[PDB]
């Protein structure tokens, strides 16, 4: 149709106005009717798969971990591929689903495809009700929300907040942290509720739980702004966020709880209203927004990934414009020698690390499997776990205190996270 290249459109429709399941099929019908080679990048592998059966019988190959010129993976996966040797179709058409989504992997993604519209390649469609820079923190819905600010609690709590238990409906609580959900639903199940918390390392699985088993409580992080489908009649939103950020250019912390964005308060907010039979939802949120950015260490990462990612000789990608001052930093800087990249690419992938991580390891010529970098660092690099230090028995058999020589907060905000780290530490993957 008019996907008839040269393009980039910014589809922008209000939150539960049909984009992911009625516009995105009837785009693909019209891409495989115009024989173009099309990538369908959905933010989460779960969503990826509910548009499985929204795409019914179509020709759609899901690279979700023929005549086949359409594929369907994740947004990370899309980026994943792009840094590897492994080949990736010069698709005709780029369809990115929820693309407010600001992990690095996305940022990267939209960076990438944009480039390759500007050389008039391609053509583009971000679908998201709340694109780079919005400032509508309570924009249109399927059904009237009632909007309410109301000071909502951040610990545990034993009186002054009746209103929180006393809802026999089902609620959408976000929180700005694993470790603050944690104590959330720890007060919500002792007061007699069941409860499902949902983060970013636990949301492939424990999200389908929402639906095949009953629940009062869903206490999750921002994850839950990408397309997730609740049948909840409540958002109680914190407003809060943390955000990872790089201090002197030597270490990641994780600053806040801090003022989410306009963005996100309304992809927050957006978790109902969504029934246009139904008025009564309320949305219960406890502050005020802020463009919190720009030091935000994710377009950081983001141009890590792409001044890895080739696309032909001499050039780097640049971001998606709208969110290109977001960083400080000059296009190709990262850019690393082959066998650099792949230890940077194996670090991420199976190393499971945060992207700047990574990068400072691979950059100082270090190989994947060499985890003495663990251990060598300064002593205020020291990790604790529970008020002490953390140790783990090397691979050389010695029991070290862990003590990374670059810093990053993100390897040891939770326990999950720990765990994980320790385990790469002891050269256990
Ligand atoms: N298979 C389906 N086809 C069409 N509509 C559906 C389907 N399943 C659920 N719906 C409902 O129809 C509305 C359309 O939802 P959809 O996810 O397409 O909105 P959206 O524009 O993607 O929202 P957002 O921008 O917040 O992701 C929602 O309120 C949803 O509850
Ligand atoms: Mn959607």
Known sequence: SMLKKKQLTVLDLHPGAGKTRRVLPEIVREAIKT??????????????????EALRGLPVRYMTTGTEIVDLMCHATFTSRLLQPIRVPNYNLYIMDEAHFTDPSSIAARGYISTRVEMGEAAAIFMTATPPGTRDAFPDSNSPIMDTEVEVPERAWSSGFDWVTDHSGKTVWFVPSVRNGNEIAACLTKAGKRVIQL??????????????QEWDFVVTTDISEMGANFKADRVIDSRRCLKPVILDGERVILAGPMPVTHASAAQRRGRIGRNPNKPGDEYLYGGGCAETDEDHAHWLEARMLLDNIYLQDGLIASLYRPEADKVAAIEGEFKLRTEQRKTFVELMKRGDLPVWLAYQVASAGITYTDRRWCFDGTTNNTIMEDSVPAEVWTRHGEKRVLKPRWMDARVCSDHAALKSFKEFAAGKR
């Open 199 to 212: 983060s970013r390392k636990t949301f492939e699985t424990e999200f389908q739980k929402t639906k095949h």
């Open 35 to 52: 024989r173009l080679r099309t990538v369908i990048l959905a933010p989460t592998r779960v969503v990826a798969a509910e548009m499985e």
